[PDB]
C-alpha cells in the first residue's frame, strides 16, 4: 500500500486538532438553571467557561436499558447534520426522574430503576450506575470538544493537489467515555487488523472513512471500505456497547489504565449522538443494538451456497462452460458471478454486444441448471451522451454537485464519470425503478447484483475518494455524508430486487462500503485482500468484528484477490471459506485461472469434500441467519460470546463458532501438522465431528490434520440439521430429508431448532408460511414440537435419519407421532464411539413425533 | 427372498429396495432414488446412447437424461431430446 496517499491523524486538521487536547479540566458545565426534565428527554444547556459558547444536551433514557446523549449548539447560524435513515425507528423512551440534587450535581433515574445517571454540572461530566455499580463515565478525562460554527487547515485545506474549500470552517465534535472494569474492546470495522482493539496511545487512531485502499496491509488501523461506529467492551463481569451514530470522518482513540479502557470519539462535522447499551450480558447488547438499527436481512437460501466469481469471465460460452464443469466434476455451486467486462465499456446496466450478446438466454440455461447469476452495478456513472443512465440522470439533476452547481465528475473505471446522489430519496426511486425487467433489459428473476466502489471511489479524488465540499441533497456537503453513501446504494439497489418481483422476492446484494444499518440490505466482503497466508488467517478476525457490530453476512475472497495462490493455499482456503458465512471465489484480472478443478486430484478432493460439507450444513446455516434476523443475534461469533468467564478466550481470532453448536479450527499455515483447538467449557464435551471421539472441556487439544482436514467440533447439547444428500446446486436440494445430529450433553440432554420456508421469498413474514421446530433430546427421548406455531408450510421434507453421539446401545427404538401408529425403527451402534444411527424415522418434518430408546 | 448388497454389506427385505433410504454401502439398493451417495442411475435413452448419472442427479429439477426418466417426482417435466 501507498500510505502517502492517505492522511494521518496529524495531516487531518480537525483530527490533528482534537487529538492535541489531552486529558485535563473539561471547560464545558451544565447551567443547572436551565435544566428542564421532560418524559422523553431532559434538556440542560451547555457552556464554554472561555469563549462562552452555549450548548444544548438532550439526555433520554430508552427502554431496553440503553441512553441515548445528544448534543448540539443552543443557536446555531446553520443546521448540522443529523444521521437520517440508520434508525430502524424513533427509539422508545424511558422516563427520567431527579432522585438528587446539591448545588453541583443531579441525579436521575431512569423509570422505577435500577439504572440512574448522575450529571455533574462543573466540570460538565455523565456516571452511569446499575444501582451502586460504576458502568461508565462520559467525560471524565475532559476530552469534550465542539467547534461551533463561525462566520462563513482549519478553513481552506489541501492534501497532495486536492484543494478542500472548506466553506464552513472548523466544525469537529468530540467525547470520551470510561469503562471501569474492562480491558478488551472489539468492533469499529473495518480494520485489517486483530479482533481485539489494540490501544492508540504511541500511535494512530483507528479511523473511519470509507476509502478504497489499494493492496491494503494487515495489522495497521488505516481506514478500509467500510465504517460500522460501534464499539463493544467485555470484562468477566458485564458486556457494554457504543454506538457513535455519526456519518462524517471519525478517528477513534484507546487507551488503557482499577483496569480500565477509555474511549475517544472525533468526528468532523455532524452532532455529538451517541446510543450507551448496557448489556449486562453481550446478548443483551445485540438485542440493544438489533432494537435501534435493524436486523440482518433474511438471505435468500441460495446466496448461502457457494459463489464461484472472478475478474473477469470472458463470454456467455466461457459462463457456460464454468457451469458445465461443477458438473462434470460433482462440485456444488449455485451462483456465478459477472465483474466489469461484461458491460459495454463499464457503462453499467449494459451487455457488451460481442461477449454477452444474449443475456437472457444465458439466465436461462443458467435456470435450467437451477443456478444463478450476479451482475456488478457501480454507482459510478460514464460521462456519455450516448448513454441513457447518464443522461436520465443529468437531465433530472440527480447527480451529486459541486459548489458552482455543475455535476461532479471525476475518473473511474469507464473514465469521466459522474455520481448519483443517493442521499436524495428521488435518486434511490429512479435507482430502484432501473431494475425492473423493462428498465434492465437482459436482467431476470435469477440475476442478482453487486455493489463495489461505492466509498465511493474517485480514481482522481483526495484519497480516491469523493471531495469533501461535494454537495448533496438538501445542501449538505459530502463530509457531512460520506459514512453511508455506500449504504444508500446498497439499499436502494436491495430496494431494486424487490420491487422488480413486486414485493415477492428476497434481494440478494453485495456491497462493498458499508455503514450501521447495512446488515438490513444483504453481504459485504473485506475487499481486495491478496493471496497470501496472513491473509487467510485474517479473515477470521475481520468478519468476527463485522459479526458483533450486526454483520453477520461477511466474507473475504477465497483464495485472496491479488496474486496467484499455492495449491495448499487455496485448499485451506476453501476450508476456511466452507465456514464463513459469505461463501465466494474471486481473482484478479491477471490471476492465473482457479476454478477448483483445476487443480491436481488430491487439492480437488479436498476442496469438494470442502464444497460438501457447506452444503450439507445449510439447514444449520439457514436457521442461524433466521436467529439473527429475528433476534440479532451474529452467526459467526468469538469463543467469549459463548463463553464469557473463560478470560483466556477474550482475545482468540484463530478459532471461531457457529451459533452455540460447532467450534472451527481451521488450518492457517503451510505445511502444518497438527492445530492446537482450545476446547473450552466447564462440565463441557465436544465432538471432533469427523471421528465421533468426545473431549472434555476445557483443554487444548492437538489434533493432527492432513490436506482434507477441517478442524470442527460440535457441543455437546446441540442438534445439528443437516442434508446429508448434496446435489449440484441449494434449489435442487431445498425439499430433501434432514439428518439431526444428536450431540448429547453430560447429563444426556440436547436441544435446537430448523427453520424452513420456500427459500426466496417474504411469505414467511407476509403469510406466516415456514416451519420452526424445536428439537429437543432428555432422558431417553428425541422429541420434535413446534418452536413457533404460527409457522405453516407445504413441504415434502422429512426426517431420513438421526445420528445420536454419546449414546449407548438401546434394546428397540419406538417412533411415535399423531395420525400415526406406533412404529419400531432399526439401529446401528458404534461401541467404540457411542454413535447411535437411526435408520429412516419417515415422518414429515412439520409433525410432532417423538423417538424413545427403550 | 431378501435383496443382497451387491459388495455382500447386508442383507435387507426387498421393501427396502428403492425405498428412499441408503441401506448398502456401495448404493446398490436404490438405484432409481436420490438416496444413496455413491449411487447411479441408469438412463435407457432409447434412440440415443444409454448412459449412467449420479444418484445426486435424481429429482434434482435438472434434465439429465435425454429421455427424461431422471425427473418423474421433482415438478419439472422433461421432454425426449435423445435425437
Ligand atoms: O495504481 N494502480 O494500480 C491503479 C491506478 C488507477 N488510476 C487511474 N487513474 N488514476 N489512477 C486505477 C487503478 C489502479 N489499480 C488497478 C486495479 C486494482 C484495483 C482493484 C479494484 N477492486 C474492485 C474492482 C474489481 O477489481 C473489478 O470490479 C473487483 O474485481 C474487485 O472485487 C473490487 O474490489
Ligand atoms: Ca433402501
Ligand atoms: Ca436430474
Redesign the interface.
Same mark, same amino acid.
Given at each position: 500500500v501507498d500510505r502517502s496517499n492517505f492522511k494521518t491523524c496529524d495531516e487531518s486538521s480537525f483530527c490533528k486538532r482534537q487529538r492535541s487536547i489531552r486529558p485535563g479540566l473539561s471547560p464545558y458545565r451544565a447551567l443547572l438553571d436551565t435544566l428542564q426534565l421532560g418524559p422523553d428527554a431532559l434538556t440542560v444547556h451547555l457552556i464554554h467557561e472561555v469563549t462562552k459558547v452555549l450548548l444544548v444536551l438532550e439526555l433520554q433514557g430508552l427502554q431496553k436499558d440503553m441512553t441515548r446523549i445528544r448534543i448540539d449548539e443552543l443557536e446555531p447560524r446553520r443546521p448540522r447534520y443529523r444521521v437520517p435513515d440508520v434508525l430502524v425507528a424513533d427509539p422508545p423512551t424511558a422516563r427520567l426522574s431527579v432522585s438528587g440534587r446539591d448545588d453541583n450535581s443531579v441525579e436521575l433515574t431512569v423509570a422505577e430503576g435500577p439504572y440512574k445517571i448522575i450529571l455533574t454540572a462543573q466540570p460538565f461530566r455523565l456516571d452511569l450506575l446499575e444501582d451502586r455499580s460504576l458502568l461508565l463515565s462520559v467525560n471524565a478525562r475532559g476530552l469534550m470538544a465542539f467547534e461551533h460554527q463561525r462566520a462563513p487547515g482549519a478553513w481552506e485545506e489541501t492534501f497532495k493537489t486536492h484543494s478542500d474549500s472548506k466553506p464552513y470552517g472548523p466544525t469537529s465534535v468530540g467525547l470520551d467515555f470510561s469503562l471501569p472494569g474492562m480491558e478488551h474492546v472489539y468492533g469499529i470495522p473495518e480494520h485489517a487488523d486483530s479482533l481485539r482493539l489494540k490501544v492508540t496511545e504511541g500511535g494512530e487512531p483507528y479511523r473511519l472513512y470509507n476509502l478504497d485502499v489499494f493492496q491494503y496491509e494487515l495489522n495497521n488501523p488505516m481506514a478500509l471500505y467500510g465504517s460500522v461506529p460501534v464499539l463493544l467492551a467485555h470484562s468477566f463481569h458485564r458486556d457494554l456497547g457504543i454506538f457513535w451514530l455519526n456519518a462524517a470522518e471519525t478517528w477513534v482513540d484507546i487507551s488503557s489504565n482499577t483496569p480500565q479502557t477509555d474511549i475517544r470519539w472525533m468526528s468532523e462535522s455532524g452532532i455529538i449522538d451517541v446510543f450507551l447499551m448496557l448489556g449486562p450480558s453481550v446478548f443483551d447488547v445485540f438485542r440493544q443494538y438489533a432494537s435501534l438499527t435493524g436486523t440482518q436481512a433474511l438471505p435468500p437460501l441460495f446466496s448461502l451456497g457457494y459463489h464461484q466469481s472472478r475478474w473477469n469471465y470472458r463470454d456467455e460460452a466461457d459462463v457456460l462452460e464454468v457451469d458445465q464443469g461443477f458438473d462434470d466434476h460433482?462440485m456444488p455451486c449455485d451462483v456465478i458471478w459477472l465483474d466489469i467486462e461484461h458491460a459495454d465499456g463499464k457503462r453499467y446496466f449494459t451487455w457488451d454486444p460481442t461477449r454477452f450478446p444474449q443475456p437472457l438466454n444465458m439466465l436461462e440455461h443458467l435456470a435450467?441448471?437451477?443456478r444463478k447469476l450476479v451482475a456488478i452495478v457501480d454507482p459510478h456513472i460514464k460521462v456519455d451522451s450516448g448513454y441513457r443512465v447518464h443522461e436520465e440522470l443529468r437531465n433530472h439533476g440527480l447527480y451529486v454537485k459541486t459548489r458552482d452547481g455543475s455535476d461532479y465528475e471525476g475518473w473511474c473505471w469507464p473514465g469521466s464519470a459522474s455520481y448519483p446522489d443517493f442521499t436524495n430519496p428521488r435518486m434511490r426511486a429512479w435507482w430502484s425503478n432501473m431494475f425492473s425487467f423493462d428498465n434492465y433489459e437482459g436482467s431476470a428473476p435469477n440475476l442478482y447484483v453487486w455493489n463495489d466502489m461505492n466509498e465511493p471511489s474517485v480514481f482522481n479524488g483526495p484519497e480516491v475518494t469523493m471531495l469533501k465540499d461535494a454537495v448533496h441533497y438538501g445542501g449538505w456537503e459530502h463530509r457531512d455524508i460520506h459514512n453511508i453513501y455506500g449504504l444508500y446504494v446498497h439499499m436502494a439497489t436491495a430496494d431494486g430486487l424487490i420491487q422488480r418481483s413486486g414485493g415477492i422476492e428476497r434481494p440478494f446484494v453485495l456491497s462493498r462500503a458499508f455503514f450501521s444499518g447495512s446488515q438490513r440490505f444483504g453481504a459485504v466482503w473485506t475487499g481486495d485482500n491478496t493471496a497470501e497466508w496472513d491473509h487467510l488467517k485474517i479473515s477470521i478476525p475481520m468478519c468476527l468484528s463485522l459479526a458483533l457490530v450486526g454483520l453477520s453476512f461477511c466474507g473475504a475472497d477465497v483464495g485472496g484477490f491479488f496474486k496467484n495462490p499455492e495449491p495448499e493455499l487455496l485448499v485451506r482456503w476453501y476450508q476456511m471459506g466452507a465456514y464463513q458465512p459469505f461463501f465466494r471465489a474471486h481473482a484478479h484480472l491477471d490471476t492465473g485461472r482457479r476454478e477448483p478443478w483445476l487443480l491436481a486430484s488430491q487439492y480437488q478432493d479436498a476442496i469438494r469434500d470442502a464444497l460438501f460439507q457447506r452444503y450439507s450444513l445449510l439447514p444449520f446455516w439457514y436457521t442461524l441467519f433466521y436467529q439473527a434476523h429475528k433476534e440479532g443475534f451474529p452467526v459467526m461469533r468469538p469463543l467469549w460470546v459463548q463463553y464469557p468467564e473463560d478470560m483466556s478466550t477474550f482475545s482468540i481470532e484463530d478459532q471461531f463458532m457457529l451459533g452455540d453448536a460447532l467450534l472451527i479450527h481451521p488450518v492457517s499455515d503451510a505445511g502444518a501438522h497438527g492445530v492446537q483447538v482450545y476446547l473450552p467449557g466447564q462440565e463441557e464435551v465436544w465432538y471432533d465431528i469427523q471421528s465421533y471421539q468426545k473431549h472434555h472441556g476445557p483443554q487444548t487439544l492437538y489434533l493432527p490434520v492432513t490436506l482434507s482436514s477441517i478442524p470442527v467440533f460440535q457441543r455437546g447439547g446441540t442438534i445439528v440439521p443437516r442434508w446429508?444428500?448434496?446435489?449440484?446446486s441449494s434449489?435442487?436440494m431445498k425439499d430433501?430429508?434432514i439428518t439431526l445430529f444428536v450431540a448429547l450433553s453430560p447429563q444426556g440432554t440436547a436441544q435446537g431448532e430448523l427453520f424452513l420456508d420456500d427459500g426466496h421469498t417474504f411469505n414467511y413474514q407476509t403469510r406466516h408460511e415456514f416451519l420452526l421446530r424445536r428439537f429437543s433430546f432428555s432422558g431417553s427421548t428425541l422429541v420434535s414440537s413446534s418452536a413457533d406455531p404460527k409457522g405453516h408450510l407445504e413441504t415434502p421434507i422429512w426426517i431420513?435419519?438421526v445420528v445420536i453421539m454419546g449414546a449407548g446401545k438401546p434394546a428397540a427404538v419406538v417412533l411415535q407421532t399423531k395420525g400415526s401408529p406406533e412404529s419400531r425403527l432399526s439401529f446401528q451402534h458404534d461401541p467404540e464411539t457411542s454413535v447411535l444411527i437411526l435408520?429412516?424415522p419417515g415422518v414429515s418434518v412439520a409433525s410432532d413425533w417423538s423417538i424413545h430408546l427403550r | 427372498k431378501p435383496f443382497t448388497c451387491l459388495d455382500g454389506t447386508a442383507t435387507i427385505p426387498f421393501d427396502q429396495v428403492n425405498? =428412499?433410504?441408503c441401506?448398502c454401502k456401495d448404493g446398490s439398493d436404490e438405484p432409481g432414488t436420490?438416496?444413496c451417495?455413491n449411487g447411479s442411475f441408469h438412463c435407457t435413452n432409447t434412440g440415443y446412447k444409454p448412459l449412467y448419472i449420479?444418484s445426486?442427479?435424481v429429482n =434434482?429439477?435438472?434434465?439429465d437424461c435425454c429421455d427424461g426418466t431422471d425427473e418423474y417426482n421433482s415438478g419439472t417435466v422433461c421432454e425426449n431430446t435423445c435425437r
Open positions: 460433482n435450467s441448471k437451477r446429508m444428500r448434496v446435489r449440484r434449489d435442487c430433501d430429508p431420513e435419519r435408520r429412516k | 425405498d =428412499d433410504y441401506d436420490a438416496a451417495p449420479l445426486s442427479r =434434482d429439477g435438472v434434465c
